[PDB]
Amino acid sequence: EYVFESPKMKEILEKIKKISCAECPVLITGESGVGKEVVARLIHKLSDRSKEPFVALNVASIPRDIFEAELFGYEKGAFTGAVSSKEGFFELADGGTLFLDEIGELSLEAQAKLLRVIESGKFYRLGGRKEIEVNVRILAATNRNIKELVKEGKFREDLYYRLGVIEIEIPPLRERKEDIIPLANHFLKKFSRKYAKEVEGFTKSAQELLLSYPWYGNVRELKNVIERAVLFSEGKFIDRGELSCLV
Amino acid sequence: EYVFESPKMKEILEKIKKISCAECPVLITGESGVGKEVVARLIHKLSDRSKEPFVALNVASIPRDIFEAELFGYEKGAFTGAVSSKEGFFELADGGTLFLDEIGELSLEAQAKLLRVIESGKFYRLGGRKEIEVNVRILAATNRNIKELVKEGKFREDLYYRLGVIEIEIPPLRERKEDIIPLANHFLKKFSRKYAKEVEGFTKSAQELLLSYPWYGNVRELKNVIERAVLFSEGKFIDRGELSCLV
Amino acid sequence: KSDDVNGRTKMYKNIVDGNHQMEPGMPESFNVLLKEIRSLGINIELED
Amino acid sequence: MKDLLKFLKAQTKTEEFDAIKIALASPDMIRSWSFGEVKKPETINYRTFKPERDGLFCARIFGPVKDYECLCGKYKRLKHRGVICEKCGVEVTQTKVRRERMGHIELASPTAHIWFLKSLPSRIGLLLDMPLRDIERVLYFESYVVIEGGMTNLERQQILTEEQYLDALEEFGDEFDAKMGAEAIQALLKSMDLEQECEQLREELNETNSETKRKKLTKRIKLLEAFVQSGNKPEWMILTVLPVLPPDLRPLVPLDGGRFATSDLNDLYRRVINRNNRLKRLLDLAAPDIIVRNEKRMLQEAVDALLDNGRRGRAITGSNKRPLKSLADMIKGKQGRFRQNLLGKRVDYSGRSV
Amino acid sequence: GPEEITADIPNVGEAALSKLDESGIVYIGAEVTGGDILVGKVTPKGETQLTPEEKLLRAIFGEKASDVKDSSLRVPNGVSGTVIDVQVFTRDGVEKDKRA
Amino acid sequence: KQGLQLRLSQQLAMTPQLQQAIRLLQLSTLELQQELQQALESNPLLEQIDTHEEIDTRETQDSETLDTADALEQKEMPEELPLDASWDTVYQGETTQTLQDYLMWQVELTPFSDTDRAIATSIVDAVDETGYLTVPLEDILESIGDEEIDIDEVEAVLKRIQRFDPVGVAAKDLRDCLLIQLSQFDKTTPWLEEARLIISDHLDLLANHDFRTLMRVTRLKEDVLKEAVNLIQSLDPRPGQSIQTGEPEYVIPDVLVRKHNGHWTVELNSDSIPRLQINQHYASMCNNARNDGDSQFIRSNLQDAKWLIKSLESRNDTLLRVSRCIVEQQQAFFEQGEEYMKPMVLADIAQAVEMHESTISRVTTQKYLHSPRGIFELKYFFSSHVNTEGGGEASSTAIRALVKKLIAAENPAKPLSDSKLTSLLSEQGIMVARRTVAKYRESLSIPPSNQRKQL
Amino acid sequence: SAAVKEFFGSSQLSQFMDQNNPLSEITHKRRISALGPGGLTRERAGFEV
DNA sequence: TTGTATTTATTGCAATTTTCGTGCCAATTTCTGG
DNA sequence: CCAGAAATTGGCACGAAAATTGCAATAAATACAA
Ligand SMILES: Nc1ncnc2c1ncn2[C@@H]1O[C@H](COP(=O)(O)OP(=O)(O)OP(=O)(O)O)[C@@H](O)[C@H]1O
Ligand SMILES: Nc1ncnc2c1ncn2[C@@H]1O[C@H](COP(=O)(O)OP(=O)(O)O)[C@@H](O)[C@H]1O
Ligand SMILES: [Zn+2]
C-alpha cells in the first residue's frame, strides 16, 4: 500500500526499524503531502504499541478557554458545569501512542502548559487532588521549521528539546524521482479499480511529463492529478493531453 | 428547472454529468451573482445523494469562538451553560453533502480546523473521548482567486490540495451575451405571476439596453432590475423608460 | 414404504404407470441420527 | 443455478458412500459445520408469530420459513433462487434446509464433556492418571490444582484446598500457578506430551513386573497409542464451542388456544444461553471472583444437563416432576433412534384384523 | 374477531345446508354419514388490503364471502348414525340463540 | 459575548427532573419482558421466579451385561421388555397437505416432459392460497432459465394445469377463472350462453350493479338476466380455498373484567403480570469484612435492583387503576354492547385519577382488555362525539353502529342513501351532517347506495 | 382446593368407572389394589406376594 | 449539644403532530315533457 | 320511448381539539460520630 523506492525512503524505513523498541517521543518535519501521517503510523505499527490504540489529535481544534479541560480532564465541582468526573485525551490513550498533528500552529501559551506532562507524565486534573501517572509515546508532526521557530521566538525552546529526542526529516517528492513513477502507477491502478475504468497504464510521453513537473503538493498533488486524469480519461492509455494541467 | 444556453454552460453541465459519479470534493471559483449555488444544487441532484439531505452553509457569519462548537458539537460538560449534547454540522450532513459559501473569506486561523476532517473523516467532539466517522461530500464556492491567496500568504495550501481536486469555473454575465435574453424572459414571467402584473415581454429598446449593458452584479442584479421594472410598470410590455435604473 | 421421501413418490408414480420397480435411497431417520450425534460434539461422517 | 432443469435435477440426488468414520471434533470443525451463532434465548415472537433474530429459530441462520421467500418479503419466487436479501439476510431457497443446518454457541469459559468424564473408565482421568474425585473437585470449583511446578516444592498435579492455596500464595508469591475449573484441566491436557509418556510407560513396564500395576500400565499405554494413532488431540475433550441442532428436529408443539408450550431440548438450550450471556456480561465488568466462580459452576452444570441429564448428580425436572430428556435420551434406550426407528418402523400398504 | 356459529356459509351448496336449522345446527332425528355438516361455523380471515381484484370479488359475489372462512364441524369419514341429542353451552354475557 | 468559557457562576436552573421509569408504561408486556431479560443479564443480583426443579437420581440402571442365566434367576419382572414386542404378545407433529402439495401431486402423475415439468413446477410455485397466479407469464419464462422456449409452451402448460382439481385454479384473473369453470359445464345448461356472454364481454357493468346498461347492450329481458346472474353467483370465486390450511391467532389479555354479585370486578391477568426477585445468595455476602470493591459493586447492584422492582410494581398499580377507572366510566357498554358507549377523552380519565394526560396516553398503549363480550383495546374506548338535540352527546362509535344496523335492515331494491340515513338519525335526536355519515359509511367498507341494489 | 382437586381427578387410584354393565360397576367399586402411592410396583413386586 | 452520608420518594410540562367534524364543487346517477 | 334536466358522492380544504413525545437524574427525611 506504501511505496518506498527512493534510497532516502529506504534509509528512513531502516531507521524506523532500528527504533521499534525505542519509546522516546519523535518529531517529524516535512512539507505538505510528503507522508508524515503514513510514516508516523508505520512507526507506531512497527513499535511495541502495534495493537495499542493510536489517538491522533490536532491541537488547533480545541478552544483556548477549555484547552486545559480537553487536555487533562476535570473533576466534579471544578467549575459551573463540572457535573461529573471526566478524563482527558492523555488519559484516553493510556499505554498507546498520542499523535500531535500540526504542532507548528500551536500558540506559545499552550506550549507552556504541557512542559511537565511530556517529560514526567504527571499532571493534576481540574478539581482532582490525586496525581495522575500516564505512559503514552508521543509522535508530533509539523510542516514548519521548528529549529528556526525557536530562534525566531515564535516557538518555545523548552518544548523543542522535550520533543527533540528523535527528529525525522522527509525530503520533498520533487527530489524523490524514484517514487514518482511507482506512485503514479499505484494511484492509476487504484483509481481504475475504484472507478471501473479500463485504463491500465501511462504512455511514455506521460511518464516523461510526470518526471519533469515541479510538484508542490508532492504525493497528495500527484494523487489529485492522477484522480483528475482518471475521471476524465477516455482511453485504455493515458496521454500527455489528459495531463495538461501540469505545463 | 434551470436554463442553460451559452456553450460554456453546456460544457459545465456536461462536466457535472461526467463527474457526478465521482465523490471528490469540488471547488468552484467565479464572481458574486454568477450562480455558484445553483450549480452546486444541480451537482447534488445529479449525484447519487439526491435523496440524501443537502446542507448549505454561509461560513462568513459563524462566530470564531463557537466555530468548533458548531462544527463538532459538544458534550454535557464541555463548557459553561451547556446541559445537553449537540450535534455537529458534519454529523448533521453525514450521509449527504455539505456546501460552503464564500470559502475565500474564511479566516486563516480557522482553516486548520478543517485540515483533518475532510481527509480522515474522523474527529472528536468538545468534551468527548470518542472518534466519529462520517461520509460527507464537500462542495465549496468562492468569488476570490484561491491560488493568489495561497501565494500572498493568506490561505493554507494543505486545505487547498484537500479541496482542489475538482475545479469548476463559472464566468460572469459579462461573457454570457447569449444567456441574457432567456434569463430576462424567465425572470419577467416569474415576477409577472408573483406580482400579478401580467406583463408578457419586452420591447426592442429594452432588450437592446439589457443586452448592451456589461452587468457587474450579473444574474442577481439583472433579476433585481426585472423585479423593479415589474413593480413599477403597468403595460403589457416593458420599454426602456421603465428601465431607468440602469446607466 | 417408511421414510425414503423421494423413493415413496417415485414408487407411487411407477406403480400408477405400471412399472413395478423402485429406486431406493437413504432413510431419513439415519440422517436424523447423524445430526443428533453431531450435536453431541462427535464428528461422524459418511466417507467416500 | 441458471438453468432450472438442472437445478431441480440436482436437489434430488443421492450421496455416494461406502464407509462411516467417527472421531472427535475440534472447535474449528464445529465452527465449519454451522451457519451462524445463536445469541438470544427467545424462540417465537408471539406478536408477529415470526422467529426472533439470533434466536433458536432464526431464519438468518437456519433458513426460510416459506419456500423461496425471505423474511421481509422483497424476493419471493423461483426467479430469485440463491439470493441473500440485504435487508433481512435470509436466503431464498427451500424451507427443508431447516432440517440440516446447525448453529453454534460461543462459551464464555471452557466446559468439560460429560461423556469423557463419566463413562467408566474416565478418559480424562486415564489420560492424566488422576483419581476421579480430584477432577470432579477441580471442575466444580471446590479445590485448586497446580499447573506449573515452578521452583517450589509443589508438584505439577497437586490439589490445594483454600487455606493451603492461601498460605502457598503468601509464601512463594508468583513462583507457582494454581487454577480451578475446566480451564485448569484444559491447560494440563494442552501442556502434556504423548511420546515421552509412551516411552516412559513402556520402559516402566519393561523393568517393573506386577499383576495389577502391569494391567494399569497396559491400559494407559493402549490409551496413549490409540490417541496418537487417531488424529484426535486431548484438549478436544474440553468444550469451547457448542453445536446447536437444526430447528425442524426440535419443533414446538402447537395447541388449541394459541399456546405453543415448550420442549425439553429447547428449554435446556435456553438455560445454557442464559447462563452464558450472564457470564459474558459479568466477565466484562471485572466483577469479584466470588460470584463468577459460582456462575462458571452453574454454566458447567447447565452444559452437563443439556448433554446428558441425570448422569451426574441431580436431574433437572419439569413442572410435573419429570426429568427433561436430553440428546443422549434421544439417542439411547428402547425409545431411541436405533430401537424405535432404525431396526424397525411402521410401513405403508399394511392392515390388520381378526 | 369472534367466530360465529351460523347457517350462512358462503362456500357451500344449498343441499349441504338442508339439515341445518336457522341457528346453523343439525335437526334432531337426521340421518348423517361421513362428510355431512353438523354445526356450521365461520372464522374471520383478517383485513385483506382492498386491491382492485378483491374489490371486484366483493362487488360481484358479496362481502360475507370475502370476510370469513368455513371451519364447520363435520362427521368423520366412516361414521354414521342418527342425531338424538344436542347440547349448547354458552358463557355468561353472551347472547343465546334460538336452539338454546 | 459569544465564547466557551470555564468559570464559577451563580445561576438559576429549571426543574427538568423527569424521564425516569416513564418508558415502562408505553411498552407492551412482551417488550417489557425483553427489557427485564436485559436487566437480569446485566445485573447479577436480579433473579426471576422460575418453575424448574432438580432432584437427586442414584438408582442403578440395568444394561446388557446382565447375563441370560441371571435374568431367569430373578423373580422380579423386567422394567422394559428386551424383546421388540408389547405387553400383550416427546411429541412431534404430522405432515399436512396444502393446495400446492395437492397440485404437485397431480403434476407428478401427468404425462409431461422434463421441460414441461419444470414449467409446471414454476407455475405451481407462483400460485397463492386463493388459487390465482400471482406473476405474469413473462416472469415464469424468465425463471425457466433458457432462451430456446417461447411463450406458447408456457401457455399450453398453464392451460393443462388449470384443468386440475379444483377447476379454475391458477387463473390469471376473475374472468379467466369463471370462463374456465364454465367450460366444464354441459351445453344442456339452460342459461349458459347468456352467462358466458356476460362474463366474456361485460363484467365491469355487473361490478357497478348497473342492470340498465347491461340489458340495453346484451338485448335481454329482466327474468333471463336474473337467471344468468344467479347462475354466475353459483360459481366459485376462490377455487383454491377447498384445501384450507391455517389456524387463527390469539392475543393474551392484560386486564380481566367480570361481573360478580352484579358488580364489575377488574383485575390484572395473573398469567402475564411481570415480576422480579432479589437473589439472596449473592446479596447475603454484603459484609464489610470482604473487599471494598466487591462491597461497592454489590451495594450499587442491590440498589438498582430494588429501584427496578419498585418501578415495576408502580407500573402494575398504575395500569390496574387506569383500567378500573375506564371500566367504571364505561359501564353501560359492558351491559348493552355498542350504541351505548359514551364519548370519552384522556382528559376525563386523567382528572378522575389525578394525573397528566401523557401518563394516561402512555399507560393505555398496546394494552388489551378481556370482557365477557370479547377482547378490546384500552384505546378503543376513547372516541369523539356529535351534538344531540337537547344538550346530549352521541359517540361516533355508537353512530357507526346505528348506521350499520340501519343499512343492514333496508330494502334491497331501494338502498338507503346518506340523505335518508341522516333523516333516520335526525328523528332520533342525532344531528350529524351528510359528510360525516358518508365518512362513517366509508370507514366500514360499505358500498354506496347505487352499488348495493339487487334484482 | 388445588390439592383436593388433584387427588380427586388425577390420582393413580382415581379412575373412570367401568360401565359395561352393573356387574362391571359392582366389581370396580369392590376392588383392592396393592399398587399406588405407598404400595408396590409390578416390576419390583416379586413372586411370593 | 450538631454536621454529614444513606434511603426512599419523585409518574409532570410544552411543543408538536395527528386527527375530528364539516362546507364547496366536479364527475356520476335519477326525474319529466314531446 | 327517448332526450333534456335534477340528486349523489368523494376529494380537498378550513379551523379547532386531542393524542404524542422530548425533556434522564433529582430532593427531603433519617441515622451516627465529636
Ligand atoms: N509511499 C506512499 N505510497 C502511497 N501513498 C503514499 C505514500 N506516501 C504518501 N502517500 C499518500 O500521501 C497522502 C498524504 O499523506 P499524509 O496524510 O501522510 O500527508 P501529510 O500532509 O504529510 O500529513 P499530516 O499533515 O496530516 O501530518 C496519502 O493520501 C497517502 O496515500
Ligand atoms: N441556470 C440558471 N437558471 C436560473 N437562475 C439562475 C441560473 N444560474 C444562476 N441563477 C441565479 O443566479 C443567482 C446566484 O445566486 P448564488 O449562486 O447564491 O450567488 P453567487 O452566484 O454569487 O454564488 C441565483 O439566485 C439564481 O436565481
Ligand atoms: Zn428480505
The verdict on whether residue D88 carries a ligand-binding annotation is: yes
Alpha helices in F43-95 (DSSP H): 68-73
Nearest to A170 by CA among A23, A47, A22, A11: A11
Assess whether A126 and A161 both reside in one domain: yes
Q: Do A8 and A176 form a contact (C-beta atoms < 8 A)?
A: yes
CA-based nearest distance A153→chain F, Å: 28
Assess whether A152 and A203 both reside in one domain: no
Q: Which amino acid appears at position A181 of this protein? A: I
> In angstroms, how far is I6 C1' from F226 CA?
30
Nearest to B197 by CA among B240, B229, B239: B229
DSSP D164-230: HHHHHHHHH-SSSEEE-SHHHHHHHHHS--SHHHHHHHHHHHHH---SHHHHHHHHHHHHHHHHHHS
Assess whether A117 and A41 both reside in one domain: yes
Assess whether B101 and B19 both reside in one domain: yes
Q: Do A126 and A68 form a contact (C-beta atoms < 8 A)?
A: yes
> In angstroms, how far is H24 C1' from D262 CA?
62
* F3 contacts A65? CB cut-off 8 A: yes
**Distance (Å, rounded) from C-alpha D72 to C-alpha D69?**
8
**Distance (Å, rounded) from C-alpha D240 to C-alpha D29?**
12
Q: Which amino acid appears at position B20 of this protein? A: S
Using C1' positions and the CA of F362, the closest nucleotide is I20
Burial class (CB in 10 A: 0-12, 13-18, 19+), B185: middle
Q: What are phi and psi of D350, to 5 degrees?
A: -140, 155
Assess whether A141 and A240 both reside in one domain: no
Assess whether B2 and B102 both reside in one domain: yes
Which residue's CA shows the smallest distance to C1' of H12?
A: F356
* D3 contacts F146? CB cut-off 8 A: yes
Residue A102 Cα distances to A105, A156, B112, angstroms: 6, 15, 9
**Distance (Å, rounded) from C-alpha D329 to C-alpha D310?**
10
Sequence-distant (6+) residues with CB within 8 A of B152 are: none
CATH at E59:
2.40.50.150
**Distance (Å, rounded) from C-alpha F192 to C-alpha F232?**
9
Is position E41 within any domain? yes
The answer to whether F77 faces chain G, any CB pair under 8 Å, is yes
Provide the 10 A C-beta neighbour count for residue C23. 11
**Distance (Å, rounded) from C-alpha F379 to C-alpha G26?**
61
Residue span of the structural domain in which E5 resides:
1-94
Residue A226 CB–ligand 1 contact under 6 Å: no
HSE-CB at D187 with a 13 A cutoff on CA atoms is 17
CA-based nearest distance D279→chain F, Å: 8
For the record, the C-alpha cell of F411 comes out as: 330494502
Assess whether A162 and A229 both reside in one domain: no
**Distance (Å, rounded) from C-alpha D246 to C-alpha D268?**
15
Give resolution, Å, one decimal: 2.7
For the record, the C-alpha cell of F359 comes out as: 401518563
Q: Please list every residue in chain F whose beta carbon sits closer than 8 Å to the beta carbon of residue G48.
A: 75
Sequence-distant (6+) residues with CB within 8 A of B209 are: B240, B243, B246
Q: Please list every residue in chain D whose beta carbon sits closer than 8 Å to the beta carbon of residue F91.
A: 253
Taking CA–CA distances from E67, the nearest residue in chain F reads: F445
Nearest to D79 by CA among F151, F141, F149, F129: F141
Given the DSSP bridges, would you call strands A122-123 and A132-133 parallel, antiparallel or unpaired? antiparallel
Q: Which chains touch G (3+ CB pairs under 8 A)?
A: F
The verdict on whether residue A158 carries a ligand-binding annotation is: no
Assess whether A78 and A168 both reside in one domain: yes
Cell 442553460 locates to B4
**Distance (Å, rounded) from C-alpha A131 to C-alpha D234?**
50
Is position E56 within any domain? yes
**Distance (Å, rounded) from C-alpha G42 to C-alpha E36?**
47
> In angstroms, how far is I18 C1' from F219 CA?
57
Provide the 10 A C-beta neighbour count for residue A40. 23
Mutation for C interface: D235, D304, D341, most C CBs within 10 A? D341
Residue span of the structural domain in which B215 resides:
174-247
Is position E99 within any domain? no
Sequence-distant (6+) residues with CB within 8 A of F50 are: none
Q: What are phi and psi of D321, to 5 degrees?
A: 55, 45
Rounded to the nearest 10°, the torsion over CA C8, C14, C15, C20 is -100
Q: Do A136 and A46 form a contact (C-beta atoms < 8 A)?
A: no
Residue F150 Cα distances to C7, D8, F176, angstroms: 33, 20, 22
**Distance (Å, rounded) from C-alpha F436 to C-alpha E55?**
23
CATH at A83:
3.40.50.300
Q: Whose CA is nearest to atom 15 of ligand 2?
A: B35
3-state secondary structure of F127: strand
Residue A91 CB–ligand 1 contact under 6 Å: no
Beta-bridged to residue E44, according to DSSP, are E68
Sequence-distant (6+) residues with CB within 8 A of A56 are: A37, A99, A101, B116, B120
Which residues have Cβ atoms closer than 7 angstroms to strand I?
A 83; B 76, 83-84; F 16-22, 26, 307, 345-347, 357-358, 361-362, 364-365, 379, 382, 417-420, 434-435, 438, 441-442, 448-450
Q: How many angstroms separate the alpha carbon of residue D82 from the centre of ligand 3?
A: 13
Sequence-distant (6+) residues with CB within 8 A of D340 are: D334
The answer to whether F82 faces chain G, any CB pair under 8 Å, is no
3-state secondary structure of B149: helix
Assess whether B44 and B158 both reside in one domain: yes
> In angstroms, how far is H2 C1' from F295 CA?
30
b vs e for E6-23, b when ≥16 Cβ sit within 10 Å of the residue's Cβ?
A: beebbbeeeeeeebbeeb
Query: What is the total residue count of chain G?
Result: 49
Q: Please list every residue in chain F whose beta carbon sits closer than 8 Å to the beta carbon of residue D257.
A: 250
Taking CA–CA distances from D316, the nearest residue in chain F reads: F54
Ligand nearest to the CA of A60: 1
Of B173, B199, B231, the residue that ends a domain is: B173
**Distance (Å, rounded) from C-alpha D329 to C-alpha D308?**
7
For the record, the C-alpha cell of B148 comes out as: 493568489
CA-based nearest distance F20→chain B, Å: 17
Q: Experimentally, how was this structure solved?
A: cryo-EM
Of B173, B193, B220, the residue that ends a domain is: B173
Long-range CB contact pairs, D200-209, < 8 A, 24+: none
Number of domains in chain A: 2
Beta-bridged to residue F388, according to DSSP, are F392, F430
Query: What is the total residue count of chain C?
Result: 48
Assess whether B126 and B242 both reside in one domain: no
> In angstroms, how far is I29 C1' from F10 CA?
27
Q: Please list every residue in chain F whose beta carbon sits closer than 8 Å to the beta carbon of residue C13.
A: 108-109
Provide the 10 A C-beta neighbour count for residue B202. 23
CA F353 distance to own-chain centroid: 32
Is position E100 within any domain? no
CA E55 distance to own-chain centroid: 24
Nearest to A4 by CA among A144, A143, A186, A141: A186
Query: What is the total residue count of chain D?
Result: 354
Assess whether A169 and A188 both reside in one domain: no
Cell 354506496 locates to F448
What interhelical angle do F99-108 and F114-125 show, nearest 10?
Answer: 170
For chain A positions 74-93, those within 8 Å of chain F (CB to CB) are 79-81
**Distance (Å, rounded) from C-alpha A238 to C-alpha A179?**
19
The verdict on whether residue D58 carries a ligand-binding annotation is: no
Q: Do chains E and F touch (3 or more CB pairs under 8 A)?
A: yes
Nearest to D159 by CA among D182, D121, D186, D130: D130
Nearest to F228 by CA among F237, F236, F218: F218
Q: Do F179 and F199 form a contact (C-beta atoms < 8 A)?
A: yes
For chain D positions 218-247, those within 8 Å of chain F (CB to CB) are none
Of A128, A156, A173, the residue that ends a domain is: A173
Sheet holding A54-58, edge to edge: A54-58, A97-101, A137-142, A26-29, A166-169
Cell 430469485 locates to D80
For the record, the C-alpha cell of A61 comes out as: 481544534
CA-based nearest distance C13→chain F, Å: 6
b vs e for E27-46, b when ≥16 Cβ sit within 10 Å of the residue's Cβ?
A: eeeeebeeebbbbbbbbeee
Nearest to D152 by CA among D141, D164, D138, D163: D164
The answer to whether E93 faces chain F, any CB pair under 8 Å, is yes
Assess whether A156 and A97 both reside in one domain: yes
**Distance (Å, rounded) from C-alpha D299 to C-alpha D276?**
7
Alpha helices in E1-100 (DSSP H): 52-61, 64-67
**Distance (Å, rounded) from C-alpha F47 to C-alpha D42?**
18
Q: Give the number of C-F residue pairs with CB atoms closer than 8 Å.
A: 5
Given the DSSP bridges, would you call strands E41-44 and E4-5 parallel, antiparallel or unpaired? antiparallel
**Distance (Å, rounded) from C-alpha B116 to C-alpha F206?**
71
Sequence-distant (6+) residues with CB within 8 A of B206 are: B237, B238, B239, B240, B242, B243
Provide the 10 A C-beta neighbour count for residue F230. 12
**Distance (Å, rounded) from C-alpha B124 to C-alpha A92?**
12
**Distance (Å, rounded) from C-alpha D236 to C-alpha F112?**
54
Q: Please list every residue in chain G whose beta carbon sits closer than 8 Å to the beta carbon of residue F79.
A: 43
Q: Give the number of A-F residue pairs with CB atoms closer than 8 Å.
A: 19
Number of domains in chain E: 1
For the record, the C-alpha cell of F69 comes out as: 442365566
Taking CA–CA distances from G43, the nearest residue in chain F reads: F77
Q: Which chains touch E (3+ CB pairs under 8 A)?
A: F
Burial class (CB in 10 A: 0-12, 13-18, 19+), G45: middle
Q: Which residues line ligand 2 (CB under 6 A)?
A: B 2-4, 32-38, 141, 219-220
Cell 377463472 locates to F177
Q: Do F334 and F343 form a contact (C-beta atoms < 8 A)?
A: no
> In angstroms, how far is I15 C1' from F140 CA?
54
DSSP D225-271: HHHHHSS--GGGGEEEEEEE--GGGS-----TTS-----HHHHHHHH
CATH at A213:
1.10.8.60
Note the strand H nucleotides within 7 A of protein beta carbons. 7-14, 20-24, 29-30
Q: Do B213 and B179 form a contact (C-beta atoms < 8 A)?
A: no
